[PDB]
Amino acid sequence: HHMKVVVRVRPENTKEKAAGFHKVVHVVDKHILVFDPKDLKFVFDAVFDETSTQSEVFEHTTKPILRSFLNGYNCTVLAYGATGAGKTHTMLGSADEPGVMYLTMLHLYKCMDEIKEEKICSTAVSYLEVYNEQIRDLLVNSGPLAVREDTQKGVVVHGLTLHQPKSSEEILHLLDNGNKNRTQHPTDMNATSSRSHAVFQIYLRQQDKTASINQNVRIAKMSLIDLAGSERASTSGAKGTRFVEGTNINRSLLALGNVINALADSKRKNQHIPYRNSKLTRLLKDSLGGNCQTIMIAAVSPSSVFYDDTYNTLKYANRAKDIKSSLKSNVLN
Amino acid sequence: REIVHIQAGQCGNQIGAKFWEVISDEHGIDPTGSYHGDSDLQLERINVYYNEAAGNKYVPRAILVDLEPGTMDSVRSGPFGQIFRPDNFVFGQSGAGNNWAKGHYTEGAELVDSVLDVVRKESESCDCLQGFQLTHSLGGGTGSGMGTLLISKIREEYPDRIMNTFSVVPSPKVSDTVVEPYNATLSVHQLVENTDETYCIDNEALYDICFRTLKLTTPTYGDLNHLVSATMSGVTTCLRFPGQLNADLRKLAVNMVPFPRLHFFMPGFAPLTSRGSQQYRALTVPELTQQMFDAKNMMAACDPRHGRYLTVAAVFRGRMSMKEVDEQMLNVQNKNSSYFVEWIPNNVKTAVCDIPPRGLKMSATFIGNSTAIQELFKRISEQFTAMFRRKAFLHWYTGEGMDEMEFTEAESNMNDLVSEYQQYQD
Amino acid sequence: RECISIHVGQAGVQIGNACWELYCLEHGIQPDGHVPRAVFVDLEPTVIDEVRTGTYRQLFHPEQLITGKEDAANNYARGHYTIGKEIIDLVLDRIRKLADQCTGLQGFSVFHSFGGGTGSGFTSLLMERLSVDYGKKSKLEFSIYPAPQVSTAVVEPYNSILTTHTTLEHSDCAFMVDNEAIYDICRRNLDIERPTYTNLNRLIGQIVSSITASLRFDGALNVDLTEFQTNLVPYPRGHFPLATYAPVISAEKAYHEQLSVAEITNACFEPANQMVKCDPRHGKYMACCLLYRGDVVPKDVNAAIATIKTKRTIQFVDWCPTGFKVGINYEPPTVVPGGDLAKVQRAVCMLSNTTAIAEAWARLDHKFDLMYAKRAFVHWYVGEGMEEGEFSEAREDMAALEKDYEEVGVDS
Ligand SMILES: CC(=O)O[C@H]1C(=O)[C@@]2(C)[C@H]([C@H](OC(=O)c3ccccc3)[C@]3(O)C[C@H](OC(=O)[C@H](O)[C@@H](NC(=O)c4ccccc4)c4ccccc4)C(C)=C1C3(C)C)[C@]1(OC(C)=O)CO[C@@H]1C[C@@H]2O
Ligand SMILES: Nc1nc2c(ncn2[C@@H]2O[C@H](COP(=O)(O)OP(=O)(O)OP(=O)(O)O)[C@@H](O)[C@H]2O)c(=O)[nH]1
Ligand SMILES: Nc1ncnc2c1ncn2[C@@H]1O[C@H](COP(=O)(O)OP(=O)(O)NP(=O)(O)O)[C@@H](O)[C@H]1O
Ligand SMILES: Nc1nc2c(ncn2[C@@H]2O[C@H](COP(=O)(O)OP(=O)(O)O)[C@@H](O)[C@H]2O)c(=O)[nH]1
Ligand SMILES: [Mg+2]
Numbered sequence A: 001h002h003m004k005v006v007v008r009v010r011p012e013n014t015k016e017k018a019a020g021f022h023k024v025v026h027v028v029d030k031h032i033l034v035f036d037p038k039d040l041k042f043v044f045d046a047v048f049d050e051t052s053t054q055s056e057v058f059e060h061t062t063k064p065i066l067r068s069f070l071n072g073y074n075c076t077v078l079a080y081g082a083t084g085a086g087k088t089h090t091m092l093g094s095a096d097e098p099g100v101m102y103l104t105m106l107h108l109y110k111c112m113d114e115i116k117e118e119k120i121c122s123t124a125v126s127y128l129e130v131y132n133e134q135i136r137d138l139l140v141n142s143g144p145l146a147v148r149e150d151t152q153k154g155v156v157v158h159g160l161t162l163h164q165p166k167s168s169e170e171i172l173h174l175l176d177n178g179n180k181n182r183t184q185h186p187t188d189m190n191a192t193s194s195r196s197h198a199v200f201q202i203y204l205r206q207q208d209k210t211a212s213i214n215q216n217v218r219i220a221k222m223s224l225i226d227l228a229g230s231e232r233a234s235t236s237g238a239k240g241t242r243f244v245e246g247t248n249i250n251r252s253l254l255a256l257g258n259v260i261n262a263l264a265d266s267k268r269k270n271q272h273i274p275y276r277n278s279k280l281t282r283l284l285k286d287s288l289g290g291n292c293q294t295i296m297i298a299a300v301s302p303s304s305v306f307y308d309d310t311y312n313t314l315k316y317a318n319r320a321k322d323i324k325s326s327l328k329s330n331v332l333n
Numbered sequence B: 001r002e003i004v005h006i007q008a009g010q011c012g013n014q015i016g017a018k019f020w021e022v023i024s025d026e027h028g029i030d031p032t033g034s035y036h037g038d039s040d041l042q043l044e045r046i047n048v049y050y051n052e053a054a055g056n057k058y059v060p061r062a063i064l065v066d067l068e069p070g071t072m073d074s075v076r077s078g079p080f081g082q083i084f085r086p087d088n089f090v091f092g093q094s095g096a097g098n099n100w101a102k103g104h105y106t107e108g109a110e111l112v113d114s115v116l117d118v119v120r121k122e123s124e125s126c127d128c129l130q131g132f133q134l135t136h137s138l139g140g141g142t143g144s145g146m147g148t149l150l151i152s153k154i155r156e157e158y159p160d161r162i163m164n165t166f167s168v169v170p171s172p173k174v175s176d177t178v179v180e181p182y183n184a185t186l187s188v189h190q191l192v193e194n195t196d197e198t199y200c201i202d203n204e205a206l207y208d209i210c211f212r213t214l215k216l217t218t219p220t221y222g223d224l225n226h227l228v229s230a231t232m233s234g235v236t237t238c239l240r241f242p243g244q245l246n247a248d249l250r251k252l253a254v255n256m257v258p259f260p261r262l263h264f265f266m267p268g269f270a271p272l273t274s275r276g277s278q279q280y281r282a283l284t285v286p287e288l289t290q291q292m293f294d295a296k297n298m299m300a301a302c303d304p305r306h307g308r309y310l311t312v313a314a315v316f317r318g319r320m321s322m323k324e325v326d327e328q329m330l331n332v333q334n335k336n337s338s339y340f341v342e343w344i345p346n347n348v349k350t351a352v353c354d355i356p357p358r359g360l361k362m363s364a365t366f367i368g369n370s371t372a373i374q375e376l377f378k379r380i381s382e383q384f385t386a387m388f389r390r391k392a393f394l395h396w397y398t399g400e401g402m403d404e405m406e407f408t409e410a411e412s413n414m415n416d417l418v419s420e421y422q423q424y425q426d
Numbered sequence C: 001r002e003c004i005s006i007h008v009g010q011a012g013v014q015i016g017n018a019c020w021e022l023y024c025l026e027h028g029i030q031p032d033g034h035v036p037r038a039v040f041v042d043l044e045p046t047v048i049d050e051v052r053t054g055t056y057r058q059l060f061h062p063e064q065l066i067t068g069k070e071d072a073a074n075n076y077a078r079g080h081y082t083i084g085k086e087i088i089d090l091v092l093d094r095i096r097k098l099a100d101q102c103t104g105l106q107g108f109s110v111f112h113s114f115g116g117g118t119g120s121g122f123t124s125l126l127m128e129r130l131s132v133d134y135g136k137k138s139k140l141e142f143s144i145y146p147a148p149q150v151s152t153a154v155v156e157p158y159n160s161i162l163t164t165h166t167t168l169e170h171s172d173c174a175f176m177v178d179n180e181a182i183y184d185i186c187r188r189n190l191d192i193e194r195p196t197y198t199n200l201n202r203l204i205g206q207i208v209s210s211i212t213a214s215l216r217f218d219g220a221l222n223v224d225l226t227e228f229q230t231n232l233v234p235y236p237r238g239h240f241p242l243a244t245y246a247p248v249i250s251a252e253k254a255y256h257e258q259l260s261v262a263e264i265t266n267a268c269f270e271p272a273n274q275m276v277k278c279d280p281r282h283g284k285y286m287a288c289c290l291l292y293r294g295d296v297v298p299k300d301v302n303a304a305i306a307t308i309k310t311k312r313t314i315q316f317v318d319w320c321p322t323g324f325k326v327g328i329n330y331e332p333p334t335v336v337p338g339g340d341l342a343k344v345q346r347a348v349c350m351l352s353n354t355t356a357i358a359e360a361w362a363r364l365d366h367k368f369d370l371m372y373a374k375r376a377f378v379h380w381y382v383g384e385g386m387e388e389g390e391f392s393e394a395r396e397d398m399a400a401l402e403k404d405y406e407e408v409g410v411d412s
């Protein structure tokens, strides 16, 4: 159905305490939120409170992943929100906390392990970034790998290395290499800003076997998206590489925002939603556009500077809610 | 502000001789001579196309990129041919084979670094760079392959500075080459994704507009090229003049591209009257908009009457009322509300220079972003599949280190580019 | 006492050269006399260069002529954020260097052209940085808002919904002169299908002279600049009166010139004479500052206005008993030696807030939506340090300007 929108907040930050300013968004109930000035009541499929932990985001986020994986439906996950707001603390985890990427990989590994015999999966692991709208493999560090389409259509990056999980932990070790391998530079706003969008996919051919020979396989790729946080001109405050990087992030997010509006109405008519606008949205065309399910974790936070960021995170929630996907089967023979 | 022209391939070169033949007289620059300029205004802004060295030798700041010696050796051995500093000639005495793959991957790919070298010597000239002019044909090796590479590298070195492209899209009726859609579909692919302003010209749309709108019975190439070079002077150099309302490449870009594809335009000149007789001087202004907005008179092949507009830019250059200009444009927008798209309240971008084309009273360059150009990338994309299906002359590409997926890619891309353009015709 | 001026954008500079021309022309200060009291800002050198090349060349300091050799761009974002940022400091420095030299000033008469790049975007932050550095003054911005059908830029509304929202919280009183509804005056009230831009500029160059020039000049009923925003703005929105002139007669054609007060005042409220396509279609006036100049008896006025107060088809607002600031000056107008302006011995430069701009704003807002509804030229601003925020959140802004200009009138 429609992608599920989850609103995730972060404990009061030094900045928030210093403002002393009401929380931007306060949840009356975990699902119900009130946004600041006015008399704004939003409802979601789910929301999380500032008290609500990453481990609540874990359970809630991974349950639709379990469903989609047993269905064979590709899982996509979008962490959206500005820098600072909690995309990495959700996705990566806190340092202490297991992250959603580890918990969903443990979850996937669980889905295959629970039933090894019917479901024999191969996992291939493909961690990439989108930096300056160039795609690079994080695991093989090289020049940006050429973008191709498949013979039919759908955009694939050739040369994204695969690995199979030796253990669950071994993916974390390689994935931390992928997490350093994305471009990062410190900012005033973040201890470390992601300069790029990061996309952990895996290629799971999961042969279900029947009779002597074989049944159908379900094919899932799953996708963890750590978007870069948006910045602004006045927020960047630095020209040069910092501006061009920040403007390159902002063009890609606009392209994505146009895609979401076009899906909601103009795609219901036709092709029009512009998958072409970014490298991410070209690969996302066969990922989301090819199959359900997606989930967006809109990270917000209660700072006053994050007001434009978080408000436009919740505007993005309305846009992603306005997106209805049908569920779509994914089967190979 | 500034720009640095680029003469990719023979055609883009041959035209370079005509673009610079013109512009120089539009700037009083004799062969190696200086500014003889009949006025004093044709000099406060020249820097856009030249450099100061001697004090009489303002050299054109272009690049001459070609794998065929005999070509640049005809442009350098003729009229204004002795104005380019020899450093500008980036030749490739290799076999300039008519293959897009031979000028983009195998033979052009070597000569590129010795080009980028100079494109940087000229960009790091002085003041502030605006962008680069690019001339070429989408129907050959050194044009569509090597010249499309030159830009894919330029757009990585300065994703800030603009990129105007003057492409000679393969004319319908007769193709002046055989693999044409191969060299073409492969370059348009690069164009849609690097340059951000393209002005597509058709050797036969010109012949028509040059044999019926000029009673000219023997339209040599020098003429076609001359006509084209007349528009690209009303675009750039022109707006680097004063005006009641002036623009510049960005205004033209920032008013004309609703969607980042880049979009391709269709230039049209204003006073296009045969010599002696037709010198009717019916150029008050309603006669220029009469001109520019007709079907015929669009240097493109396609007819605007076959598809809405997204933007228009009447870049006038000749003293006129900002009322009889800004007015006329309106009635034009209402007589043809049918074809003009609606989700843009004012499609038209009126622009007004002061000084006109040297010897004329009043002109106006037209830069139309119509959805009608859909019916050309259709054409090209058809000719592709009809021959790509049988891999026709494909062994000349693969045998040069190409890919069977590379042709697939370009067609599909540029074939999608057709799709999108229809999304606004509706 | 004084009022600096900041002519921003090519157009705000062309109008600036013109208003600046009419000045010395009525003050006996030829090409090379005193010193101006203003600055000139543009991100396109070639235009401010027309003030450096053309007439009035040496009447300026190369210090009050700011340029950014770089790029203009017909987009707000670039001109506000990205590019126009780099210049602002330097710009400010002059309106802080020129603001210091004087003696107890009153404000800055800003000149900008709403739907431009340098005129929209840059000034948006210039006025921005002023309302903080001198919140204790007058900020009267003289705008040339978008022609109602004869716009130029394709994006115009993007640039003018963004200059309005950013300046709104920063101006004191925004004068407005519509470029197209002036051409009607050049066609209908002067007869000429040859109106160069150089003429509309002579005309605003006139109405404006009535504002500062002659009013800061002694008279029988002086009107400070503060007096305006006081007697002219009912509410803190940087409210936008309309400029109008009376003896807009042709200096060649007709000649009834001798058109005693009783006539020139009635010629202001007829909608075909108001430098604005905001024809009083319903818009109740709420305050008018009739600036007269020349030979005018205060009874002729305190009677020629009384007749008007009782025309009722001129319906003033309810909550406004009397909304007529009579400003009388002495020195008659001063027409260009041989332009096309009549040359009378009296004029009426009436300006006013009308509920009428409830229209003009509406029609300009609706424009914006049609393109924003498809993002049109949005990628041109986002790529220039803006967001879905500043558009959608400046749209919501003017939305409460369609409701504001509705609620302050139409109701009792
Ligand atoms: C006596 C007289 O007035 O002669 C005119 C003339 O007869 C006409 C027919 C000219 C003539 O143009 C052509 O015949 C022509 C030939 C090949 C391709 C295209 C056009 C003219 O040759 C062209 C020439 O154009 C210019 O001088 C412009 O500055 C033009 N220059 C060039 O194209 C140029 C030509 C040779 C060498 C260097 C420059 C220009 C236009 C736009 C931007 C920059 C420059 C003009 C007015 C004339 C002649 C000389 C007969 C016309 O063309 C132009 C571009 O103005 C053709 O229709 C117009 C109307 C003119 O009245
Ligand atoms: N009255 C009057 N209006 C003018 C004049 N020049 C331009 N305009 C109007 O102002 C707008 C044009 O703004 P532009 O000249 O495009 O831009 P700008 O505001 O100078 O700044 P940039 O976009 O960065 O160049 C249009 O609506 C014109 O009709 C002028 O001299 N007088
Ligand atoms: N819910 C959370 N609980 C506690 N602290 C958090 C939480 N979420 C984020 N923070 C902290 O806030 C800071 C920024 O979080 P981070 O996840 O890196 O932001 P981001 O949204 O991904 N930034 P960027 O890549 O530039 O987008 C880090 O120090 C996090 O540990
Ligand atoms: N207008 C125009 N077209 C030209 C000229 N020369 C070649 N062409 C066109 O260019 C195409 C051929 O490509 P060509 O320029 O020979 O390629 P290259 O030289 O190998 O890069 C044909 O469609 C020709 O009509 C010219 O001087 N003017
Ligand atoms: Mg982050």
Ligand SMILES: [Mg+2]
Residues within 6 Å of the ligand: C009, C010, C011, C042, C044, C047, C072, C118
């Ligand atoms: Mg300008």
Ligand SMILES: [Zn+2]
Residues within 6 Å of the ligand: C255, C256, C257, C258
């Ligand atoms: Zn008389």
